[model samples]
Target: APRKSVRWCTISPAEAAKCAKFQRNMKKVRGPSVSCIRKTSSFECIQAIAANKADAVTLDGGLVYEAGLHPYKLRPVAAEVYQTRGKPQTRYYAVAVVKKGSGFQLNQLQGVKSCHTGLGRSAGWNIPIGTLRPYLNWTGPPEPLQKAVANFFSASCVPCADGKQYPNLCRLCAGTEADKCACSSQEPYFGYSGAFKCLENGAGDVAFVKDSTVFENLPDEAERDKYELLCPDNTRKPVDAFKECHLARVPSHAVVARSVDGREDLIWKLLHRAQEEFGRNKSSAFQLFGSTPGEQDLLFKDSALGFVRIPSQIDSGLYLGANYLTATQNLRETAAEVAARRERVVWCAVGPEEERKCKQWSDVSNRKVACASASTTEECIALVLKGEADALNLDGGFIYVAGKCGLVPVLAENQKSQNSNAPDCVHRPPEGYLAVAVVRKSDADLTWNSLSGKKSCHTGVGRTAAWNIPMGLLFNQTGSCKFDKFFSQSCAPGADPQSSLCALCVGNNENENKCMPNSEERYYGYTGAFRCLAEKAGDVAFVKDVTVLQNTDGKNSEPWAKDLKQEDFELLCLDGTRKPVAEAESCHLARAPNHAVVSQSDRAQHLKKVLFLQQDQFGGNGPDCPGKFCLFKSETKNLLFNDNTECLAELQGKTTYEQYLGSEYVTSITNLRRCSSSPLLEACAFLRA
Candidate 1:
């Protein structure tokens, strides 16, 4: 009798194709018949596997994690690392591009409200957000950033790996709900928070998306237009990018089980044979997902049956959410609690891409009325303050600035799960907060003074001055005493009495003394005085006071006395005080000398004659003169009278007299002036008259 034949189930589309091709190539080899059952969606595929309706399932890594599937339940027969053209999941990277002259930074996307494409499609939203996440330093769970993004759109659908099932909904009846439908029909769950609306009215400024389908549809045009492929060549394009656009990934087909009986050994032998045949044909037959063939035995030990695997020609129908719900739920909880406390709260989302994703989710859920600006924490806070949004999801960096601006953060993105390597379903609070300041150039000179009154603007209680130094220079003026007050008050040893104009009590007394010797003395005497005077005069001259000492004697003989020339006598005081003279040298001779009894010219000429006679009489050195007095006359008669009469008078009066008038003049003038008819007497009488 013929041996009883046992039947087994098929695993993936690759497996079925391999089995059929193997059987056809080796006509002598006997193999079981095969069939294919392609599920409508990834959810359906998972459901079929769970219910034992299908032997195996092929889905993206993210979807596997989402479904909560066990590693032992199923195995990967083969994974095509190199995808063919025109399939989704082929591209792994995304970028955001604005019109060349849009003048938009990546961060500015949050303010946009309307997007170009419908939500849920990959190119229309996902890829841009995913790509932007890492760039914006957003490592938190997707929900917060998602919620913060506002009117954003996409020119193409975004493509990414399939994700797990949404825990909020039942797998079997997700899309078939009544009041709150699941999947695409019901209000889309924004993680744990609330439902949202789509970008129906064209409100967003940024577009999250994938490669253009136009490039695929019009390859020649794409090449001519210099459209470079963004993702790796071997990677598969996701579903959204594949259908609408010409860009596509190799079709992921399915394989079916011929019979329900257990033919375990037969399946293994057949798979091994198929592998050998593929090797012979120079085709890479099997590769485990994210694993090498060498580790296949260890990784997929359970799935290695006698059956072979082959590539699938049909499309895989799977729609996995962005998994931002985890963060959204957390934000909602925080917001609800805050609202219950009656706090004036607002929420902002921070991340380059999260805002777009959040807004898309909001629109899809028809909760546009409740949606907030999902672009950034700063934007969210602004919107909330303006009554545009109720809550915000933001990076931790924006917390301090937001709080200062009267908007407080209620929730933060999860830190742990936000790691780029981790799955998107995790959530955590933000790591830190952002800081901002508004300093005007016009107020730079008055910065210290202005900030003195606003203590809260400072980083610390007395830091206003310390902070304003740089600001002062930039604004072209020194800050006010307030700065010095803070520095002195906070610094060690207390302020010096002389130095601390603002905080006399706080600064180091020694330091202050070192800086300023006298507290009451003007700190910037010249500068301050100049500034004050300039305000009134608009033009002023500064003259140093050279006469700081007083001269007790009225004569110009003191140690510090200044000589007044004859030309300057008109302006000088009669007491010999020097002053500014207005007249020229010629004017001193031409005009009457008001300050002197003798005319300037007469006095000058008389002094010159006396000096000449004295020089002639004294020569180089004469007898010691006690009072610097010199005796010399212009005429012979005057000389004789000075010697004869003055000498005789002194002798007769009993006063000692010395006749030192030179012997020659003494004898000659005595003979002439003494006799009644003498020439000396005549000349003397004439001189006297």
Candidate 2:
């Protein structure tokens, strides 16, 4: 039975013609039906989809973000795969390509002549602009980012830029008369192929484009050998090394549909059948990724291998990811809006408990503070990276991820000092915290050396005390990355739900958020992991020394810890001996950097000032502490900041994560990360490049 036809939206005559051919071919093959609906622009197509006049259309990463917003909520249903690095990939590397004899690296691109695909294109504009933002010196807004870019490069051929405002942006255009710098094919240097040609003819010193641009235009290996890619590390490599040397890896074009009642299944079925019947060299009657002589990339990106169905859970924002989303948003921001954003601090809160605490603080902060919430620390970090949230306190391990994404530490958490008589918390230098493996005192046979094959608990995966330090030391000893195989059924929040790492995590009272990385998961954070040990759910719990002391012997009144005694637990020493909890100074795995508040480098200075002022009024020993909201105190244990936190101390010149975490610890984290890298971190690594 043939279902209702999918009315695919198209932008212009070329695309409409291509859509007509596609419709005829699909009907000939007796596949899921399709119909064509013509529109004037991608935005118009998006409007058509939202109005239910059309069912689907394809869009680039930048527009995908826009299509997913507000009144027109479209979601990517399928992604186009491209031929990349001898294999088909759903993403492509945006690279800075230069002639081998150009005598300049990525860092030196400031004063070079540039070629770009188009004004608002992905690899051409958004990625390069975001990567070079720190160097742009473009004060946000009234003075357009374009003015800064126009001056940064001695000359450029950015196709859609307003040439009248910045003549230099179009100085290299080869178009005739009024056609110069036109936003259409009338401009000789308007797209990927055209931009590459500009570089070929010696009009531009560097081509800001995708990896395939050079290879696609120059089929001869010798011709391609004349150029190379500029790496973010201030070095150059052969063009073929784009996999390791590129600005960012951006998601490919995607078939988008309305967020609701868009008949996505029909679209997927149609694309699946079409690709099978006409993808690449499959047929002569029609080609899904082919273009006419006068037009290129009609409906989808020309040369795309095929389509991959996007996961149902992935919307445009998730599909584009944090880095790309932020890059696109940065291009459209106003100076006034940027100034307003810089004036206030938006704190990222993970889970319901932290979110509740953040709202209370926001209410009393005289509108200087705002709140953004997520279910996990990773998501919180992503929010900050996307510029939707301003700052968050991160553990040393999460700091590694944030730092890799170009975030800087604003302040470090200073806990109560070892000596009873201590200086003001903010004035004292911060001391590293001890990470220990805790076990029930009754488990007399278990030691650090004999922990294998035992059930365990962790303060969420990739966290400082629980996962990174303990697992890193163990990895060093065993030379294996299979932590799941080493431990029996365990509860390490943030790990894959189906794995042994999440086996013992019980959700809340109703059992809804099982194995989630937030507080909703019963066996979650430092206190949650210690509680897992106290309730005898696991043989051992990896946590900081303070966590054990704060929860045992009536220190914690929670049902699981109320009956727990200091004498009932022991710490597993690195030398295979068990010691009392009080002896953590000597019996520990590794000393970890204290948790710290982090924000984008551009916002760090302002965030630090606002936080310093806010802490003065609501910090632990502030004059208004017992009267107003206290930043360090929480009702259900550690929430936003640790309950024991006295103040947020200065980094004392250790502003960067690498500087603050120390070279040795940074190297350890780097080594540990080689086993399993976070996807978000990997995406950011490319963006950072």
- Quote each prediction's TM-score: 0.24, 0.66
For each candidate in turn, give its C-alpha RMSD to the true structure in angstroms: 42.6, 8.9
Question: By TM-score, how accurate is candidate 1?
Answer: 0.24
The 10-residue segment of model 2 with minimum total lDDT is: 418-427
Tens-place lDDT digits, model 2, residues 205-321: 999888888888788999999999899998999999998999998988889999999899999999999889999899998998888756567788888989877766566876786
- lDDT (tens digit, per residue) of candidate 1 on 470-509: 2232233332333344322211111233433322221122
Q: Which parts of model 2 have CA positions greater than 4 angstroms off? A: 1-9, 18-40, 47-62, 70-297, 300-315, 318-340, 418-428, 477-480, 670-675, 685-689
* lDDT (Cα, 0-100) at 622 in candidate 1: 20
lDDT of 2 at 573: 95
TM-score (C-alpha, index-matched) for candidate 2: 0.66
Pick out the ten consecutive residues of candidate 1 with the lowest summed lDDT.
Answer: 590-599
